[PDB]
Amino acid sequence: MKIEVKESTMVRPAQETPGRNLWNSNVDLVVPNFHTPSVYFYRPTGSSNFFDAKVLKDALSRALVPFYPMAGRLKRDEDGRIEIECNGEGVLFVEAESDGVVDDFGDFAPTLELRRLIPAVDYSQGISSYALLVLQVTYFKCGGVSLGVGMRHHAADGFSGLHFINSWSDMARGLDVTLPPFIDRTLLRARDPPQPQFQHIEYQPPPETAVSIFKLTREQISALKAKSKEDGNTISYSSYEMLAGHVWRCACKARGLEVDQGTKLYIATDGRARLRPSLPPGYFGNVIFTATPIAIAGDLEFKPVWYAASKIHDALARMDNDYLRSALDYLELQPDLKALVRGAHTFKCPNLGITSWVRLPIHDADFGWGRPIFMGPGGIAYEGLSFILPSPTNDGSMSVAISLQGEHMKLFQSFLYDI
Ligand SMILES: [Cl-]
Numbered sequence: 001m002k003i004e005v006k007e008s009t010m011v012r013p014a015q016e017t018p019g020r021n022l023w024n025s026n027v028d029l030v031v032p033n034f035h036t037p038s039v040y041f042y043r044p045t046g047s048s049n050f051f052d053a054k055v056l057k058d059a060l061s062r063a064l065v066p067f068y069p070m071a072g073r074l075k076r077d078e079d080g081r082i083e084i085e086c087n088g089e090g091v092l093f094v095e096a097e098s099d100g101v102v103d104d105f106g107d108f109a110p111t112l113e114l115r116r117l118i119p120a121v122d123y124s125q126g127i128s129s130y131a132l133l134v135l136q137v138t139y140f141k142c143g144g145v146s147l148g149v150g151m152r153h154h155a156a157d158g159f160s161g162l163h164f165i166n167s168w169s170d171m172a173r174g175l176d177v178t179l180p181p182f183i184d185r186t187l188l189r190a191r192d193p194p195q196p197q198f199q200h201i202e203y204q205p206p207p208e209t210a211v212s213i214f215k216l217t218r219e220q221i222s223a224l225k226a227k228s229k230e231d232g233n234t235i236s237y238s239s240y241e242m243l244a245g246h247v248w249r250c251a252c253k254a255r256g257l258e259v260d261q262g263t264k265l266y267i268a269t270d271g272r273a274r275l276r277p278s279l280p281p282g283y284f285g286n287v288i289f290t291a292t293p294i295a296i297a298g299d300l301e302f303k304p305v306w307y308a309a310s311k312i313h314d315a316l317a318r319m320d321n322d323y324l325r326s327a328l329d330y331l332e333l334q335p336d337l338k339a340l341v342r343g344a345h346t347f348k349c350p351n352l353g354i355t356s357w358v359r360l361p362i363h364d365a366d367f368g369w370g371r372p373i374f375m376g377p378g379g380i381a382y383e384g385l386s387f388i389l390p391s392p393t394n395d396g397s398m399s400v401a402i403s404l405q406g407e408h409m410k411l412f413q414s415f416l417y418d419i
Contacts (some may be wrong), residue, residue, distance in 0.1 A: 001100040004137060005114050006392035007053070008416045010131070012090040014061040015069035021077065027271075027332035028154050029082060030203065033342050034355035036336075036383065037118040037150035037378040038362070039110075041102055042145030043368050050135055051145045053095050056367060059172035060093060060135070066177050067164050069284065070155060074127040082154060085306040094119050102144030107211040108374045110387075110401050113127040115379035133164075147365070149371040150379055157286040158360060159270060163220060164366050172367040176239040179413040183286035188287070197326040202266065202290035203340050209383045212415055214377070215350030216243070218396030223419050237309040237379065239398075241316075241387070244354050246310030246416070247386055247400055249357065252297045254412035255349045259298030266289045267312065268355035269319045274322040289324055291315040297350065347384030349405065356388040363392050376401055387418035 044050050049066045056382075064071045072086040105114070119134040136148040158281075160181070166175050168368045225242045228235070237245070249264050257263065271287040272279050279287065293315040300308045331337065349354040362375040378386050385400035404412055 001104060001113075001116070002253050003096050003098050005096045005232050005308040005353045007095040007096055009057060009093045011064070011089040011093045012058050013058055013064035013068055013088050013407050014058075015065060016332050017065060018086065018297065018403060019090045020069075020086040020195040021075075022069050022072065022086055022183065023081055023186055024081070024154055025163050026190060026328050026337065027188060027288070028185055029337045030331060030340055032153055032157060032268070032286060032288045033266055033290060033346065033353055034288070034387075035124075035153045036381060037115070037148060038375060039108075039117050039378040040147045041104070041105070041108065041366060042147075042370060042372050044145075047369055050143065050369050051139070051367065053137065055172060056137060057093055059367070060091065062171045063168040063177075064088075064091065066180050067284070067322075069183060070133050070164055073130075074132070074154060076127070077201075082156060084132070085128070090103065090131065092119055092134040094256065096136055096138045098140045100280060101140050101142045102146070103142075107213050108376060109211055110380045110403075111211050111319045111379040112379050117146045117202070118150045118378045121150060121152075124198050138240065149376070151365045153286065156284055157270075157288045158357070159272065159287070160284045162361055162381065163282065163284070166361055169365040169367045171182075177321050179282045181220040181315045182280040182282045183284045185285040187279060187283070188285070188397075190287065191325065192236050194329035195330040196330040196333070198323060200327050202292055203327070203331060203334070205340065206345065208406045209403055209410040211401070211403045212409055212413065213401040214413060215397055215399045216416075220417075220419055221396070223399060223406055225287070227304060227419075228306045228309070230306065233305070233306050233393055237306055237313055240356060240358065241309040241312050243388060243398065243400075244307060244356070245305050245310075246368050246419070247354055247388070247402070248312075248352060249300050249305055249308045250387075250415035251402075251404065251408075252300050252350070253415045256411075257297035257301075257350050259296070259302075261297045261350050262294065263297055264292055264294050264351040265312070266315065266351065266353040267293070269316060269351075270292070271324045274319055274321060275324050282408060289319060289327055291319050308360045310408065344382050347382045349384060349408075353382070353385045355386075356387065357389055358390045358398060362390065
């Protein structure tokens with residue numbers, strides 16, 4: 001597939017915006033595990049102005065007025081801490097053309113080939129040299145379009161980033177911002193003095209890859225949830241805990257782990273509902289923390305799926321305000337946060353990462369020509385990472401996108417359908 005860039009624009013906010021040196025909390029400075037660019041696919045409607053680039057760029061420039069930090073750049077304060085200089089320098093918007101068709105991407109699994117739909121970022125001319133958000137609209141031969149989105153993690157997590165992208169789509173339709181962003185990350189300042197109450201292994205560094213996507217129907221999901229009754233168990237677990245448990249159990253079996261091999265599952269957890277007092281709605285920044293259930297492979301494989309679900313349940317139930325405040329305090333005491341590199345190491349066999357986008361508004365971006373037929377990660381960056389996606393047809397199905405070693409993938413597919 002040839003992808004040609006046709007035009008590139010640095011889009012500035014539509015009018016001047018306030019200056020500010022926007023402070024980053026310790027969870028805006030840590031690289032989140034599950035940070036990823038995303039891609040949306042749209043089918044042509046027959047409209048002659050489908051994804052008109054002037055309409056998209058004018059709306060983007062208007063959306064950057066209330067979301068002005070998105071238009072800013074990174075810089076170091078007087079103490080060397082990375083902050084966002086809100087200078088309105090703008091967001092990169094690339095228009096590209098493909099000589100292939102949307103159907104060339106098949107089920108839209110996040111292979112490295114999807115990275116080609118998001119602008120590449122040259123993070124080697126120093127922290128100020130690049131935009132915090134890069135966007136690419138690619139026009140395909142049969143009229144389909146992709147939108148690729150790459151946002152630098154200091155700016156926002158996925159929740160705040162989709163707020164922006166949805167708000168841009170609203171403006172493209174003529175609706176002003178429905179929930180204005182609340183911009184003040186000092187609400188996540190650590191205590192003074194900082195005093196952790198727990199160990200936080202998720203921030204302690206440790207002392208061929210294939211990617212696929214697999215659809216489970218609403219009935220398969222309901223059949224999985226019903227397995228909580230197995231072997232007399234009386235505790236009900238949610239669709240999410242049972243599906244996440246089943247993905248973990250299936251990955252252990254597909255990798256052929258020994259009965260006494262240990263496995264850590266890292267689960268992205270949004271702190272917005274859990275912190276006290278809870279953050280104002282529209283909080284703009286990062287609030288993702290990591291839960292870490294640990295189990296023996298023989299127990300996960302040989303006990304019913306509710307055992308893996310129970311471990312996930314217990315681990316998420318530990319993620320309360322006390323735990324999240326402790327995590328911020330632990331980070332405050334570390335000499336170097338850049339050093340807390342959460343990379344390829346972390347999710348490799350026998351460990352695993354799972355993040356769910358089921359409760360995120362990933363299909364709400366309608367720029368005037370309809371909601372997307374698919375939205376998902378634009379390429380999965382580390383082997384051992386998995387994403388649970390809600391259905392773009394609103395039919396109660398859920399898709400599991402995952403990266404595994406190639407010789408484990410067909411086993412994983414086989415075990416995922418053993419429900
Ligand atoms: Cl097409």
